[PDB]
């Protein structure tokens, strides 16, 4: 496979301000009506965040802009998206983005989510292709439009889908979805959340606490990555891809001391750097 | 085959004249119509689909209409290279299949 | 968008034979889009053949010619074999590989296969 579409432009990355955001739970010990302060990797408040354009329409007619770059992992990574239609599935996290290192491959054609830590060959323009199988008459997902080779694989796992819809809401939710990715001490851990947002794009003032999903015995350093996509095929109208619009939020983590104020219930609310 | 159009038709260049195909309610009545072009010993090319829609690369000078069981293929701005046979077709539920007419070989005079 | 592979090649089979027709594609995958077939006799018109049905999900077979010609599909290698059997007088002709949308409800045969004559 490795069918590639680059196009051209970057544009100045449209930035934003995470007000109170990215506050994951530091320990696995439940704390109610008590204050605990740790110094750990976080996304510091009111920091410089980068909101991205994935496949993007700036209207004249059409003009879908596929910009999503390979991005360094740096210290740690934060992620946020709305995507009432789901074009986003997983991320390519790795180092060489090639063989010679392992590869963290997450995808989501989801009765369920599925996770892969393997050695792949990722193409120049990787993303998950989706087509129509005409037998069972369903929509399959061609997964090798992302990567050519799958071999040597070190680890595999399956779980209930992290990405989840609700919809029926004609908006007013947008189903804002956040995922934090922190790679330490042999455990690369994933944190998820789902939140309604009525604002047009950017983030509210509310606090979002993400419980750890799975603590994975990984063992690789990931210095760079890119997201994944779900596109499809169309037929004769005046290759074919780019369902809907796609945009998301990315920011890098950083060690900071954040006092965590638990509620009577024990759910963290106020976090101060 | 089961449809109605003449073997050939002729007209002067650069003029405006169309070609029609007479079906039935069992074929053209409830179904969408297509039109095709082939040069001698060549690949028959889709002309217009649903009679109102142009495939990519078709001159806008072509149009179409469906009046009852009759479907006309709009042919305008005749060219010296426009001489070829045009074929009408539409979905058939009678034999539950695809049907065509005998074809009409245009001639640009 | 898409270009296709040829329908057959040149297949010349003397009377007392039968011939498969394997039409491959490029730029798509085989079972995202439905194939179709049309008899074209030189100096003559179109006679539709084979074909897939968007409704009911079956692969159609032209009733007039039903049972004489069959079709199979290999999804990964994009090979769709059209086997016509029991050669007769007027049945040597160009048989076009054609396609309609997998989404269905489309009658138009779309980019097609350049044509292949057969032999009786």
Residue numbers in the entry:
A (entry chain B): 14 to 251, 256 to 290
B (entry chain G): 2 to 110
C (entry chain N): 1 to 120
Manuscript excerpt for this entry:
Cryo-EM characterization of the S-FC05 complex showed full occupancy where one Fab was bound to each NTD of the homotrimeric S. 3D classification revealed that the S trimer adopts a 3-fold symmetrical structure with all three RBDs closed, albeit without imposing any symmetry. By applying a C3 symmetry, we reconstructed the cryo-EM structure of the complex at an overall resolution of 3.4 Å. However, the electron potential map for binding interface between NTD and FC05 is relatively weak due to conformational heterogeneity. Interestingly, the binding mode of FC05 resembles that of 4A8, a recently reported SARS-CoV-2 NAb. Similar to 4A8, FC05 recognizes a conformational epitope formed by elements of the N3 and N5 loops located on the NTD with a buried surface area of ∼700 Å2. The essential epitope contains 12 residues, among which all 12 residues (100%) are not conserved between SARS-CoV and SARS-CoV-2, explaining FC05’s virus-specific binding and neutralization activities. The paratope of FC05 is composed of four CDR loops: CDRL2 (residues 49–55), CDRH1 (residues 29–33), CDRH2 (residues 50–59) and CDRH3 (residues 99–106). Extensive hydrophobic and hydrophilic interactions facilitate the tight binding between FC05 and the NTD.
Coronaviruses S proteins are processed into S1 and S2 subunits by host proteases, among which S1 is responsible for receptor binding, while the S2 subunit mediates membrane fusion. In contrast to this, SARS-CoV and SARS-CoV-2 use the C-terminal domain (named also as receptor binding domain, RBD) of their S1 subunit for binding to their protein receptor hACE2. Among those selected, three (named FC01, FC08 and FC11) target the RBD, three (named FC05, FC06 and FC07) recognize the NTD and four (named FC118, FC120, FC122 and FC124) are S2-specific mAbs.
